Design a protein around this ligand. Sequence first.
Ligand SMILES: [Zn+2]
Length: 71
Amino acid sequence: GSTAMATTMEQEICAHSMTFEECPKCSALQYRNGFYLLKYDEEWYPEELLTDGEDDVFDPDLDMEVVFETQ
Ligand SMILES: [Zn+2]
């Protein structure tokens, strides 16, 4: 959405300030903002990802213990 759809985009919009999963719960009478709106559980502005480096946090200085097929 090029234009501002309920102020913030990509986090979706339903009835009143919640989550995508939470949306069927509120299709309630209030309809204040957007029950899908508060959270679409999309990461916003991850500094770690933006900064060049290792793929995962656990990747640097990872010491792996090998069980040598011993159960
Ligand atoms: Zn709806």
